Every structure is written in C-alpha cells, then in structure tokens.
Amino acid sequence: SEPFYITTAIAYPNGVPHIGHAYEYIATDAIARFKRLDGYDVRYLTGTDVHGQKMAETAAKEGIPAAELARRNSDVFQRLQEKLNISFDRFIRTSDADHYEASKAIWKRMADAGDIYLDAYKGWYSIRDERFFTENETTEQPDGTRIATETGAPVTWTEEQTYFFRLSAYTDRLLALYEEHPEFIGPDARRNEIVSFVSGGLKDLSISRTTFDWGVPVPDHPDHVMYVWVDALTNYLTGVGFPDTESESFRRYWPADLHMIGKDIIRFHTVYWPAFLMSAGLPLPKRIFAHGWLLNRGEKMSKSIGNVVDPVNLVDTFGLDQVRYFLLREVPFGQDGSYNEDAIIGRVNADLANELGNLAQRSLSMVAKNLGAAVPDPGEFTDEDTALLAAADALLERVREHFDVPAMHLALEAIWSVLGAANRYFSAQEPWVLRKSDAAEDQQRFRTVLYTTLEVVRIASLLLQPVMPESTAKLLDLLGQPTDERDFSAIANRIKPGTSLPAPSGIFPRY
C-alpha cells in the first residue's frame, strides 16, 4: 500500500469563495478518492493562507482585527468544502501553531545553507497578487499610479531593509530539473512557459518584510515578518509533520505526489518552491499541475436560479454530484473553460438523469417487479453480452491512465461511451418484449440481458465514486453491493445472482 500525498492551493480568506476554488477542490477530491479506492495510502491537504498585506488591508477596511477575519472567513471556506463533500484529512490554516515552527524551520535551513542575506529592497509590490515586480514589468498609467503589466493590479513602491533569497544561484539547477523531470510541470504548455521564463535569468527574491507585523516572525529578528508566500508554501510540509523530519508522516508522504493549483500562481510553485526545497535540503514534489479558469457565459444573475458563479447556489439549485460531474466533464482539465445556466441543465438532464439514471432505474425496476427483487441468474452469454462486458472490464485500466495525468474529463468520456453502449444494448435486446413471451429460451434470455445490464452499471457506479460520492453510494445500495466491497478490486468480481435488491428509486432527477 504505497503512500500518495496530494494538496490543493491554500487560498486567501479575504472574501467569498469563488467558482475557481470549488473547481479545484472537487478536482483534487476526485483524484484523492480515486487513489484510495485503487489501494493507496492517501494524505489530502487543503486550507487557507491567512497572513499577508492583502488580508491585513481587508481586515482594516472592515474595521476588524486581522486574526478575526482569518477565523471567520476560513470557517466559510471550510464549510464550503464540507458542503462540496471534500474528503480532506486536514484543513490547514497558516495561523496554526505547528505551522509557525515549520516556517521557522525551513527559514533556518535556507539561512544555514547561506542562501539568505540582508539587503535593502527597492521596487514595486502588488498586494492583490502578493507578488514582486520590476520597473520594466510595470506600466505607468496616465492617471499617475503604477500597475503590474501582467495582472493589471495596482503596485506600491517599497523601500525596506529586507532579507533576500539567492534565487539567482538556482537558475541552471532549475532548468536541469525541467529537462530531467518534465513531469514536474503540467500540462506541457505550462512547462515550456516556465522554461523560457527561467532561461532569461532569475533575480533574487525578497523573503521578509518590516512595514507590517501580520505574518510569521523571522527567528532571531522580531522586527521582520516572513513573505506570505514563504509562509504559504511551507504548509505542504506542515501538513505532513514538519519540522519533525524523523516522524512517520514526513518520511512516508514527503515529497508530495501532486500539487493542484490554478495557473495564476504557477511561478511560485514551479520556480520559488523547488528552489526553497533545494536550499533546505529537502526532496522536491513529483508533479505540479495547473488547471484553467471557469468563466460565465452571458449574464451573472439568472432570472430563475440567481447567482450563476456562486458555488453554494449551484449546489442548492442543481445538487452536489450534478455540479461535481459537470465541472469535471465539461472543461478539459488544464485548459480554460466557459459555462452558463443551459450548459449545466443540458449536461445534468442528458448525461446523468437520462443516460445513467434511466438505464439504472429501468433495469432495476424490471428486476424488482418481474424477477422477485433479486439479481437474475443469467444463462449462456451471447457475443453481444460479451462485447459489452469487455468494454466495461477495460474501463479501470484506461480510467487509471486518465486520472494519473490528471484528465478526469477523458475518464468520464470513457465511462459514458460504455454507458451509451449499454443503452443501445438494452434497446436492441428488448427485455420488455422478452418478459411477455411464453418460451423458456426467451425467459432465460430476459434474465441474461438484465444481469448484463446490472453488471455494466455496477462497474460504472464503482468507477464514478470519486466524481459523485453520494449518488454512486445509493446506486450500489440498489445494486446490493456490500459497503466493505466498493474498492476497484471489486470490479473484477461480478455481481452475484440471487443477491437481494431494495426498492429502486430515482437518484438522478431532472431540473
């Protein structure tokens, strides 16, 4: 049972959780659930990044302490993930006591390696991005104020005696990493962008601040606070028992197998983060994957459902598993995507309610009121039965391949291809005709067709567990599958004839 450590980006709790956060949490949960069912030892970290000037300003604007905004908004972020049914092991917050020790530990490691030095910083700083920018990287507006060229965010002139990380010393050591291990950055398009960015030379990074005190204090220097990103990135270590490197959690889970992040914070994770770990003498994570953004088509406020970009609203409107499926199916993972009210409705009613819902319900109904509510004892299998079962048995292997990319959209395409095949099979065999017949060879065939249908929807249900936890559990309840037999190892064991089935009811309803 090999360990699998997966993390999400710990977002700033300065406002209301966006659709992008929910998209990330669902996507990461799907992989984390998939690995558990595939027999892995999974640690799954998520949470919030409560420090920084961005947080301190929003707290001062709302006239409350920074620590008060930290708890309140993190509680909101945590409840969203609870509503989204995220199976995280720990919801980390950078204000945690064990995180303070971990941030001070990695700092000491880097300083002892000789990568931290005191020097006066002079330059522009974006508070919205929590990011440093150079003179050329900024555009002087006709209004007078300065903005960051890339993001378009307002930048503030900063002149402080700060601590610097010798990032310029790791340029070629980072470029070798991308060449030797191309799997480090994903998708391929992101890696090439980072290669060209690092190829143009790297400048030293300021890693402490003095103008504010909302952040992790630098050891031996109370007047200095750690750069929010040095604080933020260390969470991935904290979530596995850092600074205790001898601990069971650290020796087993570190380095992380996958960092799940949005594409707007890729430089921090693929440039700064590995350089920090190289300096600290710690193993580098195996893969960082950046997903695209989800943008609304048309109007923000609907005339029937309300706010389209509100994650909580969509779950209340359409149902959790409906939203979970849509986001993972609609947009190819890694690319930017678009959605509207009709896109969700169409996908929910066609793919879930009809293609999967009705196939399951009709077959389970025929077993209930025509076959004594028990799995039919099948007869001899025909070429049609075998070919469909072969397409279903092949799923797990390719679904595993898609999930390792990660590419949840292709996995869902693969499963629906078989579900559609199961629907055409159901239409061709005509069980509703066969149940009316008096012939013994037609009655046994009716039992075989129903058994084959139940087996395909069982395999499908087992594989769809990471995507739709609640709905698939209720499907497997109706398919008489024991709770202690819902791992991917159970796919190889066919549904047992004579297994008692409870009264079937709709699980995927239309809108």
Q: Which residues are near ligand MET by CB under 6 A?
A: 9-12, 49, 232-233, 235, 265
**Which residue's CB is nearer to ligand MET, number 269 or number 447?**
269
CB atoms within 10 A of CB 446: 24
Specify the 3-state DSSP secondary structure of 391: helix
**Using CB distances below 5 to 8 A depending on partner kind, what does residue 153 bind out of ligand 2HP, ligand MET, none?**
none
Residues 6 or more apart in contact with residue 246 via CB below 8 angstroms: none
Distance of CA 399 to the CA centre of its chain: 16
**Which residue's CB is nearer to ligand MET, number 229 or number 446?**
229
Q: Which stretch binds ligand 2HP (CB under 6 A): 36-44, 182-190, 364-372, 467-475?
A: 182-190
Give the closest residue to 82 by CA, choosing from 326, 318, 333, 315. Answer: 315
**Using CB distances below 5 to 8 A depending on partner kind, what does residue 360 bind out of ligand 2HP, ligand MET, none?**
none
**Which residue's CB is nearer to ligand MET, number 198 or number 261?**
261
With binding defined as CB under 6 A, does residue 285 bind ligand 2HP? no
Give the closest residue to 267 by CA, choosing from 137, 101, 81. Answer: 137
Continuous segment of H or E residues that includes residue 353: none
**Which residue's CB is nearer to ligand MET, number 55 or number 388?**
55
The residue count of the chain comes to: 511
Neighbouring-strand partners of residue 288: 185, 259
| Sheet containing strand 41-48, strands side by side | 90-93, 41-48, 3-8, 258-262, 288-291, 185-186
- CB of residue 468 to ligand 2HP, shortest distance in Å: 24
Residue from the set 186, 241, 285, 357 that interacts with ligand 2HP by CB under 6 A = 186
* Site mask for ligand 2HP (CB under 6 A), range 391-410, x = bound: --------------x-----
**Using CB distances below 5 to 8 A depending on partner kind, what does residue 187 bind out of ligand 2HP, ligand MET, none?**
ligand 2HP
For 38-130, where are the alpha helices, taking DSSP H only? Answer: 53-61, 66-83, 97-112
**Which residue's CB is nearer to ligand 2HP, number 391 or number 407?**
407
107 carries a ligand binding annotation: no
- CB of residue 418 to ligand 2HP, shortest distance in Å: 24
- CB of residue 117 to ligand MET, shortest distance in Å: 24
- CB of residue 227 to ligand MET, shortest distance in Å: 12
What CA–CA distance (Å, rounded) separates 11 from 337? 21
Burial of 200 from C-beta contacts in 10 A (0-12 / 13-18 / 19+):
exposed
**Which residue's CB is nearer to ligand 2HP, number 290 or number 460?**
290
CB atoms within 10 A of CB 494: 16
What CA–CA distance (Å, rounded) separates 192 from 185? 9
- CB of residue 258 to ligand 2HP, shortest distance in Å: 12
With binding defined as CB under 6 A, does residue 188 bind ligand 2HP? yes
- CB of residue 200 to ligand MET, shortest distance in Å: 24
What CA–CA distance (Å, rounded) separates 488 from 469? 14
Beta strands 90-93 and 116-126: pairing type? unpaired
**Which residue's CB is nearer to ligand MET, number 81 or number 235?**
235
**Which residue's CB is nearer to ligand 2HP, number 124 or number 289?**
289
293 carries a ligand binding annotation: yes
**Using CB distances below 5 to 8 A depending on partner kind, what does residue 405 bind out of ligand 2HP, ligand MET, none?**
ligand 2HP
CA separation, residue 129 to residues 70, 154, 157, 375, 488 (Å): 18, 9, 15, 58, 42
Q: Which stretch binds ligand 2HP (CB under 6 A): 73-81, 180-188, 208-216, 291-299?
A: 180-188
**Using CB distances below 5 to 8 A depending on partner kind, what does residue 186 bind out of ligand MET, ligand 2HP, none?**
ligand 2HP
**Which residue's CB is nearer to ligand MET, number 110 or number 415?**
110
Residue 63: which region, alpha, beta or left (left: phi > 0; alpha: psi -120 to 50)? left
63 carries a ligand binding annotation: no
Give the HSE-up count for residue 391: Cα atoms under 13 Å, Cβ half-sphere. 20
Residue from the set 17, 20, 187, 319 that interacts with ligand 2HP by CB under 6 A = 187
CB atoms within 10 A of CB 369: 10
**Using CB distances below 5 to 8 A depending on partner kind, what does residue 78 bind out of ligand 2HP, ligand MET, none?**
none
Residue type, 456: V
- CB of residue 120 to ligand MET, shortest distance in Å: 27
Tokens coding 413: 């395409």
Residues 6 or more apart in contact with residue 80 via CB below 8 angstroms: 17, 21, 22, 25, 311, 312
Cβ atoms 409, 327 nearer than 8 A:
no
Cβ atoms 325, 389 nearer than 8 A:
no
Positions 332 through 391 that interact with ligand 2HP (CB under 6 A): 334
Q: Which residue is nearest to ligand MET (CB)?
A: 49
Residues 6 or more apart in contact with residue 109 via CB below 8 angstroms: 279, 280, 281, 282
**Which residue's CB is nearer to ligand 2HP, number 112 or number 188?**
188
Positions 302 through 341 that interact with ligand 2HP (CB under 6 A): 334
Q: Residues marked as binding for adenosine?
A: 24, 262, 264, 293-294
Q: What residues form the annotated binding site?
A: 24, 262, 264, 293-294
Summarize as ranges the residues that interact with ligand 2HP (CB under 6 A): 186-188, 334, 405
